[PDB]
Design an enzyme around this catalytic site. Structure first.
Site, PDB file in Angstrom:
ATOM      1  N   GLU A  35      42.936  38.821  24.416  1.00  0.00           N
ATOM      2  CA  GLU A  35      42.658  39.035  25.737  1.00  0.00           C
ATOM      3  C   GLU A  35      44.057  39.241  26.269  1.00  0.00           C
ATOM      4  O   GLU A  35      44.140  40.267  27.130  1.00  0.00           O
ATOM      5  CB  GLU A  35      41.908  37.797  26.457  1.00  0.00           C
ATOM      6  CG  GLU A  35      40.343  37.771  26.131  1.00  0.00           C
ATOM      7  CD  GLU A  35      39.689  38.795  26.681  1.00  0.00           C
ATOM      8  OE1 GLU A  35      40.101  39.566  27.693  1.00  0.00           O
ATOM      9  OE2 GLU A  35      38.400  38.856  26.300  1.00  0.00           O
ATOM     10  N   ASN A  46      40.290  47.210  36.132  1.00  0.00           N
ATOM     11  CA  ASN A  46      39.151  47.918  35.495  1.00  0.00           C
ATOM     12  C   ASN A  46      38.659  48.960  36.145  1.00  0.00           C
ATOM     13  O   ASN A  46      38.968  49.027  37.599  1.00  0.00           O
ATOM     14  CB  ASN A  46      37.797  46.858  35.526  1.00  0.00           C
ATOM     15  CG  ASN A  46      38.482  45.640  34.580  1.00  0.00           C
ATOM     16  OD1 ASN A  46      38.334  44.257  35.030  1.00  0.00           O
ATOM     17  ND2 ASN A  46      38.940  45.740  33.520  1.00  0.00           N
ATOM     18  N   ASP A  48      35.873  49.315  37.940  1.00  0.00           N
ATOM     19  CA  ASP A  48      35.198  48.981  38.940  1.00  0.00           C
ATOM     20  C   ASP A  48      36.156  48.565  40.105  1.00  0.00           C
ATOM     21  O   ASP A  48      35.627  48.234  41.374  1.00  0.00           O
ATOM     22  CB  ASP A  48      34.197  48.026  38.672  1.00  0.00           C
ATOM     23  CG  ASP A  48      34.583  46.969  38.302  1.00  0.00           C
ATOM     24  OD1 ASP A  48      35.981  46.770  38.130  1.00  0.00           O
ATOM     25  OD2 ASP A  48      33.829  45.723  38.190  1.00  0.00           O
ATOM     26  N   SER A  50      37.991  45.690  39.901  1.00  0.00           N
ATOM     27  CA  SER A  50      38.494  44.534  39.864  1.00  0.00           C
ATOM     28  C   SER A  50      39.646  44.294  38.801  1.00  0.00           C
ATOM     29  O   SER A  50      40.112  45.354  38.100  1.00  0.00           O
ATOM     30  CB  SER A  50      36.943  43.863  39.072  1.00  0.00           C
ATOM     31  OG  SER A  50      36.904  44.343  37.751  1.00  0.00           O
ATOM     32  N   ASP A  52      41.428  41.849  35.896  1.00  0.00           N
ATOM     33  CA  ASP A  52      41.620  40.598  34.824  1.00  0.00           C
ATOM     34  C   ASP A  52      42.880  40.035  35.073  1.00  0.00           C
ATOM     35  O   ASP A  52      43.944  40.494  34.910  1.00  0.00           O
ATOM     36  CB  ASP A  52      41.191  40.988  33.614  1.00  0.00           C
ATOM     37  CG  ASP A  52      39.697  41.813  33.434  1.00  0.00           C
ATOM     38  OD1 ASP A  52      38.938  41.542  34.091  1.00  0.00           O
ATOM     39  OD2 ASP A  52      39.686  42.542  32.326  1.00  0.00           O
ATOM     40  N   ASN A  59      38.255  37.586  35.542  1.00  0.00           N
ATOM     41  CA  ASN A  59      37.977  38.690  36.344  1.00  0.00           C
ATOM     42  C   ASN A  59      37.682  38.359  38.008  1.00  0.00           C
ATOM     43  O   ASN A  59      36.881  37.678  38.163  1.00  0.00           O
ATOM     44  CB  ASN A  59      36.730  39.388  35.888  1.00  0.00           C
ATOM     45  CG  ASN A  59      36.468  40.636  36.520  1.00  0.00           C
ATOM     46  OD1 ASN A  59      35.582  40.517  37.443  1.00  0.00           O
ATOM     47  ND2 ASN A  59      36.686  41.817  36.204  1.00  0.00           N
TER      48      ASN A  59
END
Ligand SMILES: [Cl-]
Ligand code: NA
Length: 129
Positions: A35, A46, A48, A50, A52, A59
């Protein structure tokens, strides 16, 4: 902070992650490696809108507040910046909430695609735990 593999293992073990909801320590270390490459400062945006955050790439759509993800929730009740700290306590506490929510570690895409079904014990092998 960029953790060593064994250093993070030891840290996660201390925070109650080993066998948490049935997932052995190796699964958490594996997920963190893929990750974030063990970097508490990792961020990724991301499609959308959002982002991380942190060592486990939690998220902002559901888990933390970063003031820029409209209509999102803050289920961990924390600012997302707190997940970037050299102290992993906030990330661990929040990950425990996520892995309890029904989908287990499948919530971590890198765990599902790169750790699940593999010999995850290999990630803690040789560590003094
Ligand atoms: Cl599960
Ligand atoms: Na949020």
């Amino acid at each position: 902070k960029v953790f060593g593999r064994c250093e993070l293992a030891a840290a996660m073990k201390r925070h109650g992650l080993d066998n948490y909801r049935g997932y052995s320590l190796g699964n958490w270390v594996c997920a963190a490696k893929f990750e974030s490459n063990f970097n508490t400062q990792a961020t990724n945006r991301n499609t959308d809108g959002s982002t991380d955050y942190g060592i486990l790439q939690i998220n902002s759509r559901w888990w933390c507040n970063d003031g820029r993800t409209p209509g999102s929730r803050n289920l961990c009740n924390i600012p997302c910046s707190a997940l970037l700290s050299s102290d992993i306590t906030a990330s661990v506490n929040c990950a425990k909430k996520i892995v309890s929510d029904g989908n287990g570690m499948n919530a971590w895409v890198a765990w599902r695609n790169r750790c699940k079904g593999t010999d995850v014990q290999a990630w803690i092998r040789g560590c003094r735990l």
